[PDB]
């Protein structure tokens, strides 16, 4: 058994392996999640869309359960382990409690699993950040973010990936009660957020929405293209 301390404290008091895992998060696709009134929107930028790539396989938005879905940023192979481990726990929680998992619970389990890899022998930290969105049993929309360190916080809106700082700065200015009055405005908010870092346009945007008492709905490219026209249309009248 490989029993070695990968993550150790630097003399300043930093866990450098955790910081390096957070550096891999900054090299991933920009994932944007906005918590609306009755909808949760997850938006992920697509890296170098190839006409020969099956878009079904490389999907950064996956459903842990019927009411919880997450989008990641970082190492794709690292994330798929976390999603599978989270998926198994969602079914274990449902078997014991006979109640669908809460977003707080599965973001706590993923964060605890991520933290365990920053303090366990022979294991390097998970190099992904998760944007977990979903709905509780009482219909409250919840949006949570985890980092490789293991810290989870609830966000009204957040961005992870390479352009997280730019999108988050954009989100802090445009996230208002009026901007999430309707589902369509909430979906436009993520597209407006992702247009700040996506250069080409809607062809590099993957959108997944989840409504209350509904399953995760991946938005087709035609539906996304319809939205970007509206934002482009609304840009003209504001000039």
């Amino acid at each position: 058994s490989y029993d070695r301390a990968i993550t150790v404290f630097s003399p300043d008091g930093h866990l450098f392996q955790v910081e390096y895992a957070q550096e891999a998060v900054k090299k991933g696709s920009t994932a944007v999640g906005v918590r609306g009134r009755d909808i949760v929107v997850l938006g992920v930028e697509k890296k170098s869309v190839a006409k020969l790539q099956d878009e079904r396989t490389v999907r950064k938005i996956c459903a842990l359960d019927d009411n919880v879905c997450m989008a990641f940023a970082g190492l794709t192979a690292d994330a798929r382990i976390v999603i599978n481990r989270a998926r198994v726990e969602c079914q274990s929680h449902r078997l014991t409690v006979e109640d669908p998992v809460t977003v707080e619970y599965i973001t706590r389990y993923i964060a605890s699993l991520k933290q365990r890899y920053t303090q366990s022998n022979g294991r390097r930290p998970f190099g992904i950040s998760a944007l977990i969105v979903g709905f509780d049993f009482d219909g409250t929309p919840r949006l949570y973010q985890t980092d490789p360190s293991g810290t989870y916080h609830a966000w009204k809106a957040n961005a992870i990936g390479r352009g997280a700082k730019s999108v988050r700065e954009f989100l802090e200015k445009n996230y208002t009660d009026e901007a999430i009055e309707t589902d369509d405005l909430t979906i436009k908010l993520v597209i407006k957020a992702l247009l700040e870092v996506v250069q080409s346009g809607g062809k590099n945007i993957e959108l997944a929405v989840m409504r209350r008492d509904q399953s995760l709905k991946i938005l087709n490219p035609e539906e996304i293209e319809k939205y970007v026209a509206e934002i482009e249309k609304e840009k003209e009248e504001n000039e």
Partner: protein, 405 residues
Amino acid sequence: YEPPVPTRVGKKKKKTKGPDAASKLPLVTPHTQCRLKLLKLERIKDYLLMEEEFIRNQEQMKPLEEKQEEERSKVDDLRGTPMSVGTLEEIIDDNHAIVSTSVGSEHYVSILSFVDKDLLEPGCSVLLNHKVHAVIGVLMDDTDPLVTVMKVEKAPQETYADIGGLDNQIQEIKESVELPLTHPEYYEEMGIKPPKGVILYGPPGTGKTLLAKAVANQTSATFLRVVGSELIQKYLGDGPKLVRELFRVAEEHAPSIVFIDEIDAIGTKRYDSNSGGEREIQRTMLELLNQLDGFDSRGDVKVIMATNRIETLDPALIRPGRIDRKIEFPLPDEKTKKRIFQIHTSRMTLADDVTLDDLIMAKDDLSGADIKAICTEAGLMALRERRMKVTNEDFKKSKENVLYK
């Protein structure tokens, strides 16, 4: 017997070099064409008018032996011909010094009165009388061949307009190498010394040298360029000696900008000619540490370093105080890649069937060097077919040449 004691404080020469000498007229203000400036201008003229009359009267009654052209003629007689070139080994006294001729024989000779005594420093080239070897002048040292290598005599033709997408990078680099010289008042009114050092790091081809070339084009200061691999020498101590001499040329040509391009190449490449191994490179680095931020006071020297491997550098080399700013040069995005293609295809004549949007996605990890290499090879393909207009087929065969194979 008692040892002679100098009246001059120390053994080094005067720091000031290349001044206006006695032509240092008082700085008259304001520069506006007003009466106060006219009154001050007349004021300087009045004293000169007195000066001209006073000096003429003395020389008029001065003895025929003591005349400006006669004393100069007597100086040549005192100097004699030929005028031997020696080396100043020690300044024993104000008018006495130990000098060595080219044959290695030292002499205890007398420094004559007409010698510029404030140019005297140990190791300097002194002019000696052929017969009595007395110090009779100091040879203004010719520009070393080592000086000519660092100095970029002609500013490169690359401007900031030829750089696309590095708007923040230009802005950060300007504020440490350009803004402090053009508008030094901004830093003085704020009470801050300008950012001391700057390092440009990123993937290869991202424009690190290009921004330095743009800096060298629009700089009033001397630009010295040295590749990091040039600091690996074939002899012990020469590497540290060269780093010491490089910043010595920077001191003389103040204000100056020293560009240590490919600084990481000093350690990431091992050459058998380097007698000392990694240990001599470490001593070369330790000399570089002192020059960037050390005991000796640094004049108006701004240091630019460039590297595509910043993780391999000694962390103490790029610490704040030595290199204040660490400007990153990422691979271009779609907006920047289009600008780079426009920059390098501007002087081209293109065909109507060529489109830069398709050329944007030639490769995901596309750098500006690859973009430029596509263009020049595309033009070379057109040159082969005796054409001036570059077609899309030329660009297609261009991508398969530079990006692949």
